[PDB]
Amino acid sequence: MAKKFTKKGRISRSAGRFGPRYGRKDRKLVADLEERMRAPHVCTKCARPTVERIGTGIWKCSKCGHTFAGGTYIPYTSVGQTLLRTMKNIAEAK
Amino acid sequence: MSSINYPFVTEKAMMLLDENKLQFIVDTRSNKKQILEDVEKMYGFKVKSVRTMTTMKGMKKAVLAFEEPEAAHEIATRIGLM
Amino acid sequence: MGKRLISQNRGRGTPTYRAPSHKYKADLRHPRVDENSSLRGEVVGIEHDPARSAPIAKVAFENGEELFLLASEGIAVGNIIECGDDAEVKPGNIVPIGNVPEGFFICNVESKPNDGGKFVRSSGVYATVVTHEATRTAVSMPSGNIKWLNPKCRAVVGIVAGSGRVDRPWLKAGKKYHKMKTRAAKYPRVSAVAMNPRDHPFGGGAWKHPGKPTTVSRNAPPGRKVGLIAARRTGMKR
Amino acid sequence: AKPVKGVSRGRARALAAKRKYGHCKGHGSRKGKKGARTPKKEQWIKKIRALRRRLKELRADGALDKSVYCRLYRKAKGGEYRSVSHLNSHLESEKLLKKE
Amino acid sequence: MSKGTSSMGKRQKRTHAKCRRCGSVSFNVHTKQCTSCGFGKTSRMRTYKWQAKCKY
Amino acid sequence: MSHNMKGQKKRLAKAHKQNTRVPVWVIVKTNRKVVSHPRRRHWRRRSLDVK
RNA sequence: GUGAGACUCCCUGCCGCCGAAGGGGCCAGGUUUCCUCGGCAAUGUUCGUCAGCCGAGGGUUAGUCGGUCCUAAGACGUACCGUAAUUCGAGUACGCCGAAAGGGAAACAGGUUAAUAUUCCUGUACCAUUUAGCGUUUAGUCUGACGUCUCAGGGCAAGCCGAGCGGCGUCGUCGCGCCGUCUAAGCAGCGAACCCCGUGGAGAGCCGUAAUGGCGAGAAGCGGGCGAAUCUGUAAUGGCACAAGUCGGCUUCACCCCGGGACCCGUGAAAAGGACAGCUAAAUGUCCGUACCGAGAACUGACACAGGUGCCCCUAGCUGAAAAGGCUAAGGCGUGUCGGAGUAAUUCAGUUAAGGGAAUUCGGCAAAUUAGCUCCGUAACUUCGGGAUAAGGAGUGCCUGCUGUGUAGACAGCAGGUCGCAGUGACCAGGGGGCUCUAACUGUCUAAUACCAACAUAGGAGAUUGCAAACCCGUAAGGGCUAG
RNA sequence: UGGAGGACCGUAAACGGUAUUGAUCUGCAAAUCAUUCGUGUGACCUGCGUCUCGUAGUGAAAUGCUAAUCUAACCCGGCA
């Protein structure tokens, strides 16, 4: 279903395009960022894992076309989640 | 300030007398409309178009294609080119 | 006259240090609203702003004035934007901070009333409304300063979109080169110790060193105020 | 105007006929990398198009219903078959056609 | 590549055109000013006291 | 094929017709005391100060 | 032959150079160098009857090609304001310019001259504006109008193959080799993908693509609409020795249409113009450029300069991965403008050199070795990406006959025979490895003695500043950073 | 299968200019030629346009470059 994750080759991940350059720390950071960004994201409207990046901070649900502005690499940031749940508590409590 | 100087006669300029055309040396400041109007005033013959060009000697050569037949030969005879 | 610093060249305003102003989408500011007035509008599209490397929302209001807006996080297409004091405290809304409950996050804050938004505009930054008083209101800015602002200073609720942009390491001089193409900044920058003594205060010598203390006074003239300008302290946290 | 003395091509045509038969093409004449003489993506393209066309014709004439045609299509996607002949031999081995 | 005859074959363009007001090839094509008479900068003709010597 | 306007071609025309020798009768009339002028030139030399 | 005068000019033949540039087209630039005639005092690295020279005369024709029009980076003007003052200065408001390679209303084939040609002539067209007749707005949108990489489908120039037909070459024997067998815009018609609409009802899942994918928030299937390049028909008489002039097939780039995907802390221009209400008639379509070179002789470097501008855009057959290199077309040339002579030393650049093989030298400097492709195999160390073409090896031609994949071009493979010292037979084309120092790496650098360990870099850290800020420019008006 | 990379090999495409301390050094050339070399999908090369300049500009920083001129250009003037 996926690539031949070879007996040695699941360390570089997507950052094997950089070859041996740029050191292990920066390659690890960029590989983790690509893994976090490329994962499926459930849309808030249609609730289907279809949200995908279109630009720097722009995300779009492929099914319902719900285009929204989020993080540069992650759609929903934890601070925005904190703000939304704070307003949710304020609306529920009163 | 006449636009017409004189008819232009070379071997190539006399090659168009059979074609009803007649090539003139005109004032370089003039345009096609002024050459057409001044030729029609000077000889009365009607002109169909004007093919103008400026040469490297500092002059302008105009070729007037007439409408009535034999107007080029008539003008050449009246001027004495032929 | 030893040669003027890079800061003096930048202040003179030469093409090397000028921003490519034609590359940017639009100046970001809050819509102009008369006092005791309001306007609604809907998002017609999320675009990309080269000036900030973050999304900006194209908002069509009720008077038909298509105005680019700074995009808070979570704003989408077809959302309704509201302005004025009567506007509900909701993410993406433009309201005075005097109506915002304490503890909320705001961004694109105005220094003065009807300012257009000065503070809290980078990708992901936010401010916290701390306290409410009759003539004042405290907002905890992204730096950390408890700035005191007027109660009528508008601000859009929510954190600025594009959070996490600096999380990715640059990883390559070409990537930062391509970012700095659309910027006003000079890239790359030569270290001052590598310069000759005519060019910088710190240049010259048989070996790379300043030769003088890098902490410069606040009362230094232009062309001398380099290094650590007016430092309270130096070094890592011992 | 004197005649054009164009480059003759009879020896070239003789060599082309021999090459068409399969000769004059050994490893001493191959000078370019295997991948320039024949690209790999074109080989995949022709192979998968032949396999999908054979499966489409089998599903069209009723010899291959949708339940096994879908599996065979995904198998041809996954590279289980080497050619149309290999697909036919596997079909006649595991009997995926609706023989009646 | 050199600074001498190698890079002097790139002189296929102009920086001064023939000025209207004086007929001299001194009209800069970028500043729009003739550097001999000053047409395009002033109504008067540029003339300076250092163009000749002190008369004493 | 440099693309001249009208005045540039007029200036090149005057430069072209300046580049001709003195007539023979001028030399004969002047007792051969006028045999040249400064405007003689060749195209494969110092370029024109025309355009 | 010409000429008084011939290595040097002209014709013929032979032998040659370039042939992905030394050929073809044109920007900037040159400015008549273009073409015909007549000369050789100077120019030409010799002479010269020759000539980009000297002298005389001639040559450039536009509604359709460009400029013109539009706006971009960005200039300039007027006013305000500043300045001792201005021809000086930032900003603002109103204008105006800014691209012969961005946007863009429209023309093609053949002929003609010594030199002009999508311009002149023949044929067949098309575009715009205004005037008149006949009626209407849909008027707010679309187009103009967009980056990089990668790829599918369709078409086509160029190329190639088979049959017939017409000429030329070869013809010691053979029956082959070469050339040609042509047909534009405009007008009329069909329309592949994508998109939209009407039905449809798919899950112990089905439909697809090269690949990603799509689907009850409605897939497959069936219809319909919108819709390309090209193709077909006409233009059908033009040119071809009025000689054939008719056919089939393959391939098709780097050209055109169309669609998909991926990437971005890069988001990849604007405006004029154009479409949606036009149809018919007539007249008008001014001005500028148009020759010629575009470079080992027409530019620039003092020059007929081995540089640079231009390798900026195109370039046929064979070999071959190839536009590499070699050999040939077409085309351009024998002008990278001195000849005879074959007799030393020495010298610039090459070929070969017994036995030894770095003993030379500051130092393997130079030269030599190896070299393509397929297959086997590949170590230390490592940031797990690499090192790696590591290293170390085998095969390779030609002929006879076949097989497999593909729709096809073509690709891959096998059996037997056979020649040579040698089968990537020429051309083409890494020598390899180990241990240290230094810098992480790609990059940048003393144009004209230093391509380095220096500079930059990502990474790390520190400092100032809450924006009427920090920092900086200006005498000021006012500005850069900052559409932050 | 896929087609990422300041990835690799590589041209007499383009750009650069290592070594021969070869040729040349009153040269083809006021720095060029031959062979040998580095980059050659990007911090790339380059046409045209436009802008930044003298105690000033530009500089991946050598006091390099700013018209064969640079630890302060060039022209005229102070200057006999």
Ligand SMILES: [Mg+2]
């Ligand atoms: Mg004209």
Ligand SMILES: [Mg+2]
């Ligand atoms: Mg100092």
Ligand SMILES: [Mg+2]
């Ligand atoms: Mg005086």
Ligand SMILES: [Mg+2]
């Ligand atoms: Mg050859």
Ligand SMILES: [Mg+2]
């Ligand atoms: Mg001589």
Ligand SMILES: [Mg+2]
């Ligand atoms: Mg204009």
Ligand SMILES: [Mg+2]
């Ligand atoms: Mg280094």
Ligand SMILES: [Mg+2]
């Ligand atoms: Mg360093």
Ligand SMILES: [Mg+2]
């Ligand atoms: Mg390379």
Ligand SMILES: [Mg+2]
């Ligand atoms: Mg210099």
Ligand SMILES: [Mg+2]
């Ligand atoms: Mg002096």
Ligand SMILES: [Zn+2]
């Ligand atoms: Zn959704």
Ligand SMILES: [Zn+2]
């Ligand atoms: Zn002037």
